[PDB]
Amino acid sequence: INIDRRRKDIIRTININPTNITITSIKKTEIDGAFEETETEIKCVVRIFNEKTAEKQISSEKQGTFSSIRTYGMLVSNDVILEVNSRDSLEFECIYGRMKIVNIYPQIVKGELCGYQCSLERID
Amino acid sequence: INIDRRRKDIIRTININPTNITITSIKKTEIDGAFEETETEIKCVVRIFNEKTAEKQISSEKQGTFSSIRTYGMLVSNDVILEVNSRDSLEFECIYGRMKIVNIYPQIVKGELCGYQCSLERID
Amino acid sequence: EKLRLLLNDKDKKSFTDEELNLFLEEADCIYCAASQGWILKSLQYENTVGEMYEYKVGQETYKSSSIKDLVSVAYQNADKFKDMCTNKKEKGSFMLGISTEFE
Amino acid sequence: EKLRLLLNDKDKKSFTDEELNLFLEEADCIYCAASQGWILKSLQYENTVGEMYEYKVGQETYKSSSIKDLVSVAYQNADKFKDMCTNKKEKGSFMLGISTEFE
Amino acid sequence: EKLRLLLNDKDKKSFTDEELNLFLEEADCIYCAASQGWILKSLQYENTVGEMYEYKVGQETYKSSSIKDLVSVAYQNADKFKDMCTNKKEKGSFMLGISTEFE
Amino acid sequence: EKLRLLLNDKDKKSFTDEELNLFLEEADCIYCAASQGWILKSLQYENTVGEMYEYKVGQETYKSSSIKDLVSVAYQNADKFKDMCTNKKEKGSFMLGISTEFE
Amino acid sequence: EKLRLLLNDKDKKSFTDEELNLFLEEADCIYCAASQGWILKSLQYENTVGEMYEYKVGQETYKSSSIKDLVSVAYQNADKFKDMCTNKKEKGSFMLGISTEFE
Amino acid sequence: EKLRLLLNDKDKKSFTDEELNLFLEEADCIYCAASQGWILKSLQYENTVGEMYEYKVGQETYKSSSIKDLVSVAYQNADKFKDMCTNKKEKGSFMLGISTEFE
Amino acid sequence: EKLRLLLNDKDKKSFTDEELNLFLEEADCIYCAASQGWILKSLQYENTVGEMYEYKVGQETYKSSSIKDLVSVAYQNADKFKDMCTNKKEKGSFMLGISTEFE
Amino acid sequence: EKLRLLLNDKDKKSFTDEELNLFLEEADCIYCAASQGWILKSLQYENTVGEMYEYKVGQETYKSSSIKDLVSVAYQNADKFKDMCTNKKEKGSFMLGISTEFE
């Protein structure tokens, strides 16, 4: 596969049903055996789609109640580099509940990156 | 099936979308009832692909926090012998988390090894 | 208005008025202009549907008619307008006299 | 009312009334006008039912008739109305008594 | 401008203006040159849309029209342009006189 | 430059220009050379698409047009160029005079 | 060099050079030699791509073109080269005179 | 060499060279021997492919061309060699004289 | 040896030698005898490969050529051997001359 | 021996010796008897395959040729035997004289 086709396909399919977002990245950095957080924001036009049929898990104890579902995927172009990690997180305030990028599958062709396929939780 | 057919297929498949890799092998050897580790490094051109639609596991505890996922497979030619045991490991530095060769399926034809099919954890 | 009738006779929003007036002055009857414009419209489908006519994303699936069907309908429209023009110009058979000269 | 008859022949709420009057003025027989209206109505399917004929989203799969089938049915209707119009105009075979003056 | 019309006959930027001028110089009528340009454009689909018509990766699948369909459409366009040019050129049947001297 | 015109009539990077010059000197008309070169290009596909025309790896599935379709389009290009050359070379019918000696 | 031209007209490294020289000895025209070479190359497909056209192992599926498609393409190439040679040698129709001696 | 020419025409070394020499003794022409040998070769595909042509064990799935396709290509090869021998032996049409006796 | 030649003209160890030499006695031309043997061998497929052409047990699927395909191939072989026999015996057309006594 | 020759000519161990002998006294030539016996054998398949030709129990799956294919091969065998018998009886054309009577 020529890379330009992959780029054109991702840009098109994003433009079929785009949504503007403001992904806010909170990167933990180790400092003296503890974390120091640096909050940053980035904006990307991105398509959101269903990728699984799953049930909404509900967690409720003395810390607080929150319910999350792990169905929505995400597809974002190459315009911005994303990294989600045990120490780094990416979220954005979509209406109908906060979204959180659990995992990022990078669409690479011949060692050149041309978009990310991505998975979300809709933390209600 | 002929051995040469399989060899051509695997080499072509690797060459569609190859990635240079530096697998670092850490082999544990029993010495006086304990392990002595001998770290060795190898290089192989490799194609990486999605084999499973798995979900990211996170394991947080007082020892530390790390999150892995079993999505990515891997395909490598016959140029180098690989072996993964309880006492042996093979990992390498992909920019998006370190990969770790969980399992090695050796593609054998008539008792002649022709390449390894492989499965990975991308340890974030 | 003849330009208005042409923009009705094919799709409306996809062309600027200059090239439609160019079609109108190319051929007398407006149906020929509509046929030629429909072929020109049919040209567009190499991008829209040729590049992708059905794609799946996650659980979402989308399918559209292939480029062959779309250009088939476009050419069918153009050919129908061509036939309409020819029939408008068509006239039946005739039977006429001859008149030589002699002395 | 002729316009009502056409708007019942050619299915309603697609075109506004003035172009229907134009259709009727273009041809005295209402069926020829209805055939003309049907062939121009077949172009509307490019917008009313786009090239995307089938899609699935979540737990909803909808499969509609492709544009080729709809335009083919529109052409069938136009040809049927044209044939019915010609049937209205049609007259049978004839044989007549030819003659000429002579001394 | 003839070159602008030719670009509008070929969906614009796949060739450069020198090739378009060469095509126009090849044949006086614009439509024959456009047909030749379409035939040459059909070659370029081997790069624009390679033999890989369909592919699935991750949660995405895209099914492009195969190269055979695209070149078939391109040749159909070229044939239509050639037919239109011959329609512009060709004249109907004729009957003429004959005369030779005698004495 | 006729070498450049031929490299346009084919794709640009798959051959050494010296054997293209060999083709050019092997046939007067450049279109015959381009047709023969297109057959030569068709010869290549036995390695590319004959070996494997659609394959799957993990979740990734890639499909491409069969060798039959690619060879068909290549032969279609070659035959279209041959027809273009023959039409450039052909001439219409004629009506000539006969004349012989006699005394 | 005739051998290089054959090894390009007929794809390379299936045969050995002395065999190619024998082929050129069998026929003066290089295209008949290339046609015969292609026909005897089509027999090689029994070994290069065996009857096993598709196989899935582990998580890899490979679908090669079957032997029938490859040998059919080889025969198409051979027939095209034969046609090229016949077009090279063949001359058109023509009249001639007759002269019988007589007292 | 005649035996080597047969071992090349027929795919190399599936049969003993002595019965190949027997084929050579049957018909003087190498091509008739190759055709008959190819039919004899086609006879063996029953064991190879008749009782199994696509099978699946565990995850692994293997497929191969049916017996009909393999027999078809083998018969096509034999028939092609038969045609080659016949065209080698053929001769064109021609005119001859007659000379009776009279006094 | 004629019997060995027959056991090569039709695969081995399925018939006992009494049947073979009976076939040879039935027809001097060994290819006619081979055709007879092949049609009689076509009956054997009812036992060697029964009507069950495909079956799966556990995780082990086997698909064999149906009995219809095998008998079709056997009949094709028998027809080819019959054709070879006819080509062996048949002579071409030719003229003769009649003479009848007369006073 | 005729009974043994028939039991070879039709697949063994399906009819009692009385029925086979009945076929022998039915027709002079044994080949007609074999053809009729093959039709009689073809009658049996309704029980064996009409009630079931592919079934699946648990994981295990079993498929077999339909009754149409099996009766087709049986009728092909019977018809081929009939044609072979008629060909054995067949004789070529002739020219014969006439001898009337006259004083």
Side-chain angles (χ1 to χ4, degrees):
Chain A
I1 184 170
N2 48 12
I3 182 159
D4 56 357
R5 177 165 175 174
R6 196 83 181 78
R7 197 172 304 291
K8 183 148 46 48
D9 285 326
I10 282 156
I11 287 157
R12 184 177 60 259
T13 188
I14 284 158
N15 291 354
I16 298 300
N17 188 5
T19 64
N20 285 265
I21 55 179
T22 56
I23 310 185
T24 175
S25 72
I26 280 154
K27 296 189 283 185
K28 290 163 166 59
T29 81
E30 189 272 332
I31 292 295
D32 301 317
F35 289 137
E36 176 62 284
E37 310 205 323
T38 70
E39 185 271 333
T40 74
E41 281 197 356
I42 57 181
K43 317 195 186 289
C44 278
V45 296
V46 160
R47 172 157 179 183
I48 288 153
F49 55 92
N50 298 60
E51 61 164 6
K52 292 169 62 153
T53 303
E55 308 87 52
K56 178 145 65 61
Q57 295 97 28
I58 294 153
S59 169
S60 186
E61 81 301 3
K62 70 174 82 72
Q63 186 169 2
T65 296
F66 87 109
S67 77
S68 87
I69 185 166
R70 179 36 197 81
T71 52
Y72 289 84
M74 157 169 294
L75 171 47
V76 56
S77 75
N78 190 23
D79 58 0
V80 179
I81 178 156
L82 303 186
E83 197 171 26
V84 162
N85 189 14
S86 46
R87 291 174 162 173
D88 313 331
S89 75
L90 297 178
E91 294 168 81
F92 53 94
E93 176 71 21
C94 193
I95 186 59
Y96 301 106
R98 179 70 71 77
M99 296 295 173
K100 175 166 191 292
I101 291 166
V102 167
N103 189 6
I104 287 162
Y105 301 111
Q107 305 302 291
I108 289 161
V109 190
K110 290 197 170 61
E112 168 68 341
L113 189 137
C114 64
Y116 305 95
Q117 275 188 62
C118 178
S119 51
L120 310 182
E121 293 181 354
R122 188 168 65 77
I123 282 152
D124 295 340
Chain B
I1 189 171
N2 312 128
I3 188 66
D4 202 356
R5 170 58 179 288
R6 195 91 183 77
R7 194 166 308 292
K8 288 172 59 45
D9 272 3
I10 278 156
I11 286 160
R12 194 199 327 112
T13 307
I14 285 158
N15 289 354
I16 307 315
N17 186 9
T19 68
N20 291 77
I21 299 297
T22 63
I23 285 147
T24 181
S25 72
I26 289 163
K27 294 186 282 185
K28 290 162 162 59
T29 82
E30 187 272 331
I31 291 295
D32 301 317
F35 290 141
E36 177 63 283
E37 308 203 331
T38 68
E39 187 272 334
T40 61
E41 208 173 80
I42 59 182
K43 300 180 185 294
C44 281
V45 305
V46 168
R47 172 152 179 191
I48 288 152
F49 54 91
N50 310 112
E51 63 173 7
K52 283 158 73 89
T53 175
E55 196 72 66
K56 182 139 75 71
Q57 295 100 28
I58 314 188
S59 169
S60 189
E61 56 164 54
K62 63 187 165 59
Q63 171 154 32
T65 301
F66 86 111
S67 66
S68 83
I69 195 174
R70 265 285 300 99
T71 311
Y72 293 87
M74 154 167 154
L75 172 55
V76 62
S77 76
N78 197 31
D79 57 5
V80 178
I81 189 169
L82 302 185
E83 188 178 3
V84 179
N85 307 318
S86 42
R87 291 175 163 176
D88 303 330
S89 71
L90 305 169
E91 308 168 70
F92 47 91
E93 268 280 335
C94 196
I95 300 98
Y96 299 124
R98 299 183 73 253
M99 325 293 276
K100 169 161 190 291
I101 291 169
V102 168
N103 190 5
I104 284 281
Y105 299 111
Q107 308 303 284
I108 289 159
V109 190
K110 291 195 171 63
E112 162 66 337
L113 181 67
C114 203
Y116 302 101
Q117 272 199 245
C118 173
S119 48
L120 308 184
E121 282 183 353
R122 184 248 284 170
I123 285 156
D124 291 331
Chain C
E1 184 167 307
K2 184 172 72 171
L3 184 150
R4 177 67 274 170
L5 190 152
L6 189 140
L7 281 168
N8 183 9
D9 210 356
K10 62 173 185 67
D11 198 354
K12 195 161 60 167
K13 318 315 299 189
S14 181
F15 283 143
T16 70
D17 307 334
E18 151 55 15
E19 58 201 353
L20 310 193
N21 195 357
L22 185 148
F23 299 144
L24 287 171
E25 67 187 4
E26 274 278 329
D28 198 328
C29 194
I30 192 162
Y31 301 123
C32 276
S35 169
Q36 190 175 178
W38 262 107
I39 280 154
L40 268 298
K41 188 166 163 82
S42 74
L43 302 181
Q44 276 163 345
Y45 295 141
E46 66 176 0
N47 315 125
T48 296
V49 184
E51 290 203 49
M52 178 272 290
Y53 68 95
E54 68 183 21
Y55 76 107
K56 171 169 178 81
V57 175
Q59 294 308 130
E60 302 191 358
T61 307
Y62 300 87
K63 308 194 182 157
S64 70
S65 284
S66 72
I67 190 167
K68 286 280 279 299
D69 288 33
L70 275 75
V71 294
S72 160
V73 57
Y75 278 39
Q76 186 171 301
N77 279 339
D79 166 42
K80 182 57 56 145
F81 288 176
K82 192 70 129 175
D83 270 359
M84 188 192 298
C85 181
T86 302
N87 295 350
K88 175 59 67 167
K89 197 82 198 70
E90 189 268 2
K91 310 292 149 215
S93 311
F94 284 80
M95 193 275 288
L96 280 63
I98 306 303
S99 47
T100 192
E101 57 280 54
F102 209 80
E103 308 88 335
Chain D
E1 174 47 45
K2 53 196 198 161
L3 185 139
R4 183 221 52 65
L5 181 58
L6 186 138
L7 209 61
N8 279 253
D9 279 10
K10 176 206 188 266
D11 194 358
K12 59 164 54 48
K13 305 295 101 179
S14 163
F15 296 176
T16 70
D17 307 301
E18 70 281 24
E19 54 263 34
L20 312 184
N21 292 316
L22 189 68
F23 278 112
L24 298 194
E25 289 294 328
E26 185 54 28
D28 58 330
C29 181
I30 190 165
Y31 294 162
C32 189
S35 171
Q36 198 63 18
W38 260 114
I39 178 58
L40 272 74
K41 188 168 152 74
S42 83
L43 317 186
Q44 307 301 322
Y45 295 142
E46 199 275 327
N47 316 309
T48 69
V49 170
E51 54 260 28
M52 192 267 287
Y53 66 93
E54 190 201 64
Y55 66 98
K56 169 174 177 189
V57 293
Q59 276 149 343
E60 292 178 353
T61 291
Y62 298 115
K63 199 179 199 182
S64 82
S65 315
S66 88
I67 195 165
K68 195 177 186 185
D69 293 340
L70 295 198
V71 66
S72 166
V73 168
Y75 277 54
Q76 264 193 253
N77 300 334
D79 293 356
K80 194 58 51 157
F81 282 115
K82 194 78 72 151
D83 283 358
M84 190 183 312
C85 182
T86 56
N87 191 0
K88 197 176 302 315
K89 184 195 157 50
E90 173 264 308
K91 299 163 206 63
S93 299
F94 281 92
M95 65 187 286
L96 314 174
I98 182 61
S99 63
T100 185
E101 75 286 20
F102 191 83
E103 187 275 343
Chain E
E1 174 47 52
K2 51 195 193 186
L3 188 151
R4 182 225 48 72
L5 179 56
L6 190 67
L7 283 164
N8 285 249
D9 272 25
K10 288 164 43 53
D11 288 342
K12 209 177 65 48
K13 294 293 105 179
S14 71
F15 296 166
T16 59
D17 308 293
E18 318 94 336
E19 293 88 333
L20 310 183
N21 285 253
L22 183 63
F23 299 159
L24 292 170
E25 294 296 328
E26 182 44 41
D28 61 323
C29 191
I30 193 171
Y31 295 146
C32 177
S35 180
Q36 187 65 10
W38 259 115
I39 295 163
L40 295 174
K41 190 172 165 79
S42 75
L43 313 188
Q44 287 192 333
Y45 290 143
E46 191 276 331
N47 319 308
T48 304
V49 176
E51 54 264 7
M52 183 175 292
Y53 69 93
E54 183 178 2
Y55 74 105
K56 155 165 173 82
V57 58
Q59 306 288 257
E60 311 169 355
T61 82
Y62 308 101
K63 187 176 203 193
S64 67
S65 296
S66 87
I67 193 164
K68 188 171 181 184
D69 288 356
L70 288 176
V71 301
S72 166
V73 175
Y75 279 53
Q76 203 186 353
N77 297 340
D79 292 357
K80 260 292 187 297
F81 281 13
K82 187 181 284 295
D83 283 349
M84 189 190 305
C85 192
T86 58
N87 189 1
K88 192 183 301 317
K89 192 260 184 180
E90 185 269 2
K91 305 319 302 165
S93 310
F94 285 93
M95 60 190 301
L96 299 173
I98 305 92
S99 44
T100 179
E101 69 277 19
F102 192 86
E103 187 75 345
Chain F
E1 180 162 299
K2 63 184 180 293
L3 169 54
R4 276 309 327 157
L5 190 152
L6 181 136
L7 285 164
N8 185 8
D9 270 348
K10 299 168 57 49
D11 273 14
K12 200 145 58 167
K13 317 302 199 321
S14 188
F15 284 143
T16 71
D17 51 357
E18 61 90 20
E19 55 183 1
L20 274 54
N21 191 0
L22 185 142
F23 292 171
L24 289 173
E25 67 184 3
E26 189 166 3
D28 196 310
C29 188
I30 188 160
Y31 300 150
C32 282
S35 163
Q36 182 165 189
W38 264 107
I39 302 305
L40 266 294
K41 204 145 192 281
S42 162
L43 306 182
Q44 274 162 348
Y45 294 143
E46 66 181 1
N47 318 130
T48 301
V49 172
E51 296 290 329
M52 173 223 83
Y53 71 94
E54 70 182 2
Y55 79 100
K56 179 170 171 82
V57 167
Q59 297 289 74
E60 310 194 11
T61 304
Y62 299 167
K63 307 187 173 171
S64 71
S65 293
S66 162
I67 191 170
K68 273 285 209 71
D69 288 83
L70 298 205
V71 163
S72 165
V73 57
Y75 278 27
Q76 199 171 325
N77 282 340
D79 305 327
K80 183 57 55 145
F81 282 17
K82 180 64 71 175
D83 272 11
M84 176 177 57
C85 175
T86 300
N87 305 134
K88 287 292 296 304
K89 185 70 203 81
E90 71 92 24
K91 304 292 151 221
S93 314
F94 288 86
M95 169 152 186
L96 278 295
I98 303 305
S99 182
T100 188
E101 63 86 10
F102 211 78
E103 57 273 14
Chain G
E1 174 46 50
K2 55 195 201 169
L3 185 143
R4 185 221 48 67
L5 174 54
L6 188 76
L7 198 70
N8 289 108
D9 269 15
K10 180 265 289 180
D11 208 352
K12 60 183 281 289
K13 300 294 186 181
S14 164
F15 288 66
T16 57
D17 305 301
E18 77 293 23
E19 300 166 317
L20 313 186
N21 288 260
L22 184 64
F23 270 85
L24 303 200
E25 286 178 358
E26 282 288 85
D28 60 328
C29 182
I30 191 161
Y31 294 156
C32 289
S35 159
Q36 196 68 8
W38 259 117
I39 292 168
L40 298 186
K41 186 168 163 78
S42 84
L43 314 184
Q44 308 287 325
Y45 293 144
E46 214 288 329
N47 312 306
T48 70
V49 179
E51 54 263 14
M52 184 177 291
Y53 70 94
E54 193 201 42
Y55 74 103
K56 174 180 167 73
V57 63
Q59 310 205 276
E60 299 152 24
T61 316
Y62 302 112
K63 193 176 200 193
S64 73
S65 299
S66 82
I67 193 161
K68 190 169 183 187
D69 288 355
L70 289 184
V71 77
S72 165
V73 162
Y75 277 41
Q76 286 192 9
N77 298 341
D79 293 357
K80 264 290 189 286
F81 285 4
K82 294 288 287 190
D83 285 349
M84 285 170 72
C85 170
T86 56
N87 299 335
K88 182 177 307 309
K89 70 188 285 293
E90 182 270 359
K91 305 320 302 163
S93 55
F94 57 92
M95 317 178 42
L96 290 175
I98 295 157
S99 45
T100 293
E101 73 287 21
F102 203 97
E103 181 269 330
Chain H
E1 199 273 359
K2 185 194 250 205
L3 198 151
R4 180 50 42 199
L5 287 168
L6 199 150
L7 268 168
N8 165 42
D9 290 331
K10 167 171 268 170
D11 216 358
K12 186 161 65 171
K13 195 46 52 188
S14 183
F15 284 164
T16 66
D17 52 356
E18 63 89 14
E19 63 197 359
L20 268 63
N21 187 12
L22 184 141
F23 297 160
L24 293 173
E25 290 186 357
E26 284 283 328
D28 60 355
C29 199
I30 184 64
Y31 278 27
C32 280
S35 172
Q36 181 168 184
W38 263 105
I39 301 300
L40 270 298
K41 191 164 162 73
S42 181
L43 295 190
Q44 81 207 348
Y45 283 147
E46 186 275 348
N47 310 304
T48 307
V49 184
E51 54 265 28
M52 185 271 285
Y53 66 96
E54 86 193 0
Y55 82 100
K56 157 169 184 80
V57 68
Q59 297 274 84
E60 306 182 350
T61 304
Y62 300 164
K63 314 200 179 159
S64 71
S65 290
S66 161
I67 188 167
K68 219 177 219 177
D69 285 86
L70 299 192
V71 165
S72 168
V73 62
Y75 275 40
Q76 186 185 276
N77 284 334
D79 171 70
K80 174 56 61 159
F81 287 171
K82 193 75 143 187
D83 273 1
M84 287 184 182
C85 182
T86 292
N87 306 135
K88 263 180 78 204
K89 188 69 195 75
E90 73 93 22
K91 307 183 195 175
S93 302
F94 47 87
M95 183 182 326
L96 304 177
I98 301 89
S99 59
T100 193
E101 286 175 346
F102 212 79
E103 305 87 60
Chain I
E1 175 49 51
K2 51 197 203 169
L3 187 138
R4 183 222 52 65
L5 197 144
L6 192 70
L7 278 175
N8 286 76
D9 275 18
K10 66 182 290 294
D11 283 333
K12 211 187 309 311
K13 300 167 278 289
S14 309
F15 283 60
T16 47
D17 305 296
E18 51 266 44
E19 287 102 327
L20 279 67
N21 62 19
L22 196 83
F23 303 140
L24 302 192
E25 291 293 329
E26 187 58 21
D28 56 334
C29 175
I30 198 170
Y31 296 150
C32 189
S35 168
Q36 191 67 252
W38 255 116
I39 175 159
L40 262 71
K41 194 165 155 71
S42 68
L43 321 178
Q44 309 288 309
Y45 294 137
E46 212 285 313
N47 311 317
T48 69
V49 171
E51 53 259 28
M52 176 186 300
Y53 67 93
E54 192 201 46
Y55 72 103
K56 153 166 180 186
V57 289
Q59 57 195 358
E60 199 191 76
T61 308
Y62 297 117
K63 187 146 138 185
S64 70
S65 300
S66 176
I67 192 162
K68 185 166 185 187
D69 288 353
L70 292 198
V71 300
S72 166
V73 166
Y75 278 50
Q76 202 185 354
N77 299 335
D79 293 357
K80 261 293 190 289
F81 282 113
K82 195 73 67 150
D83 283 359
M84 285 170 71
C85 165
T86 56
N87 298 334
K88 190 175 302 312
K89 68 170 295 314
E90 183 269 0
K91 299 289 94 175
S93 55
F94 54 90
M95 326 205 305
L96 313 174
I98 300 98
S99 56
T100 187
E101 70 281 19
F102 194 86
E103 185 274 344
Chain J
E1 198 275 327
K2 284 172 70 176
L3 169 48
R4 292 306 328 162
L5 189 152
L6 200 157
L7 274 161
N8 182 10
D9 209 358
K10 156 159 52 48
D11 188 74
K12 293 160 68 173
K13 315 318 303 169
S14 67
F15 295 127
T16 73
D17 303 329
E18 153 55 10
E19 297 144 358
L20 302 173
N21 200 350
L22 185 150
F23 301 144
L24 275 71
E25 288 89 6
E26 189 67 50
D28 195 315
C29 184
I30 190 157
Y31 281 23
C32 287
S35 173
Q36 190 173 182
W38 264 101
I39 298 286
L40 269 297
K41 189 195 281 281
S42 187
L43 299 189
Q44 270 163 0
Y45 293 157
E46 90 190 346
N47 315 127
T48 301
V49 187
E51 284 144 306
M52 188 290 294
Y53 66 97
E54 64 193 52
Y55 78 101
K56 151 170 180 78
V57 67
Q59 290 293 91
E60 308 186 352
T61 307
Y62 298 81
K63 312 198 188 167
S64 77
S65 310
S66 159
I67 190 164
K68 275 286 210 73
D69 291 331
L70 293 168
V71 68
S72 160
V73 56
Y75 276 38
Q76 188 182 279
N77 279 354
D79 167 70
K80 192 59 58 144
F81 284 4
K82 190 164 182 66
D83 289 331
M84 169 161 69
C85 187
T86 302
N87 191 1
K88 180 181 281 187
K89 194 78 193 80
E90 189 272 336
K91 308 296 147 183
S93 312
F94 306 108
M95 278 172 69
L96 280 65
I98 306 96
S99 54
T100 191
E101 52 275 61
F102 190 83
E103 194 277 330

